Design a protein around this ligand. Structure first.
Ligand SMILES: *[C@@H]1O[C@H](CO)[C@@H](O[C@@H]2O[C@H](CO)[C@@H](O[C@@H]3O[C@H](CO)[C@@H](O)[C@H](O)[C@@H]3O)[C@H](O)[C@H]2NC(C)=O)[C@H](O)[C@H]1NC(C)=O
Ligand SMILES: *[C@@H]1O[C@H](CO)[C@@H](O[C@@H]2O[C@H](CO)[C@@H](O)[C@H](O)[C@H]2NC(C)=O)[C@H](O)[C@H]1NC(C)=O
Ligand SMILES: *[C@@H]1O[C@H](CO)[C@@H](O[C@@H]2O[C@H](CO)[C@@H](O)[C@H](O)[C@H]2NC(C)=O)[C@H](O)[C@H]1NC(C)=O
Ligand SMILES: *[C@@H]1O[C@H](CO)[C@@H](O)[C@H](O)[C@H]1NC(C)=O
Ligand SMILES: *[C@@H]1O[C@H](CO)[C@@H](O)[C@H](O)[C@H]1NC(C)=O
Lengths: 93, 50, 106
């Protein structure tokens, strides 16, 4: 089975596929609920809208733009996320 | 079975924020190789000497 | 990249067939609970901080920098006006002190 014999084996990896998923989930939760403060020390909570406003402010656009177009930005993000599933589900991998 | 780390939970809320009130200065090291040993081989003597 | 945390400066050292760096970093500590709001409405106008966040000491309201706790009184020099008070979600009523008219009224 799987060729085998003749002294050719395959060693299983140290980290299973569950530990990696746990790590990625922890990273996602930290990024969502802390922003970038958890990468330099203790995680500090902050509302998501304020974090996005500060990320807008970091690229040269004043923070009132998000506070005026929050609904449009959320809808655009949701549609963009939805399109990724269709893009990946196609046979053209 | 190896342990990934300590469990934690962030107290997320609609209107809540945390601001630090003190700081700590940390100093850490880091080691990086640069060069190795230079060697030369005398092939004629090594293949067969004398 | 240069150490863990907020980088300040580095000092190099020599090692056999190698090199050693000493990274100096800035690490925050001792956080506290606080209550925040996105905007403050004074006279039918929306006020936003310049380079700070809105914080509440249970009863009063202040503005402070995001990396160190340093409360200050909300004035017209700390915030800028844009729009009205019916488009931002979570706006909080308060008052903004004008540091010019009341004392320098002569
Ligand atoms: C911010 O954190 C620093 C430590 O990183 C605080 O300094 C430390 O303050 C404590 C007391 O709060 C000091 O402990 C005591 O100090 C006295 C005076 O020397 C000494 O007689 C006692 O035996 C005891 O050690 C500690 O020494 C001090 N650390 C240093 C390096 O001076 C600082 O107070 C904090 N500031 C705020 C606003 O929280
Ligand atoms: C939060 O901070 C405010 C700002 O100082 C405190 O206000 C108190 O009431 C007036 C406001 O100037 C002062 O006469 C008091 O001395 C203030 N108390 C202080 C400075 O301890 C307020 O008490 C603080 N705490 C709460 C729960 O609101
Ligand atoms: C903040 O202030 C605004 C304006 O003063 C308040 O809006 C008024 O709300 C009352 C009801 O409590 C209405 O009868 C008025 O018509 C509203 N407009 C005005 C100009 O008075 C608002 O209620 C206050 N509170 C909040 C949470 O926004
Ligand atoms: C935050 O506010 C929104 C809108 O008012 C609400 O739907 C949501 O349940 C709130 N989250 C809480 C109270 O945890
Ligand atoms: C802030 O308060 C909430 C409830 O009052 C509490 O669960 C939370 O632990 C507090 N934050 C910190 C950093 O202790």
């Amino acid at each position: 089975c799987a060729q085998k014999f003749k002294g050719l084996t395959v060693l299983p990896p140290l980290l299973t596929d569950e530990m990696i998923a746990q790590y990625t989930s922890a990273l996602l939760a930290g990024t969502i609920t802390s922003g970038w403060t958890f990468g330099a020390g203790a995680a500090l909570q902050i509302p998501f809208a304020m974090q996005m406003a500060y990320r807008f402010n970091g690229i040269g656009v004043t923070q009132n733009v998000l506070y005026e177009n929050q609904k449009l930005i959320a809808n655009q993000f949701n549609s963009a996320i939805g399109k990724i599933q269709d893009s990946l589900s196609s046979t053209a991998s | 079975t190896m342990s990934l780390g300590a469990e934690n939970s962030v107290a997320y809320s609609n209107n809540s924020i945390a601001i630090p009130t003190n700081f700590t200065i940390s100093v850490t090291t880091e080691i990086l190789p640069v060069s190795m040993t230079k060697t030369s081989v005398d092939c004629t003597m090594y293949i067969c000497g004398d | 990249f240069c150490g863990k945390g907020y980088h300040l400066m580095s000092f190099p050292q020599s090692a056999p067939h190698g090199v050693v760096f000493l990274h100096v970093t800035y690490v925050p500590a001792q956080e506290k609970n606080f209550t925040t709001a996105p905007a403050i409405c004074h006279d039918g106008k929306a006020h936003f901080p310049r380079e700070g966040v809105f914080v509440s000491n249970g009863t009063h309201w202040f503005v402070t920098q995001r990396n160190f706790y340093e409360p200050q009184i909300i004035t017209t020099d700390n915030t800028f006006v844009s729009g009205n008070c019916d488009v931002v979600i979570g706006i909080v009523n308060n008052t903004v002190y004008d540091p010019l008219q009341p004392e320098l009224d002569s």
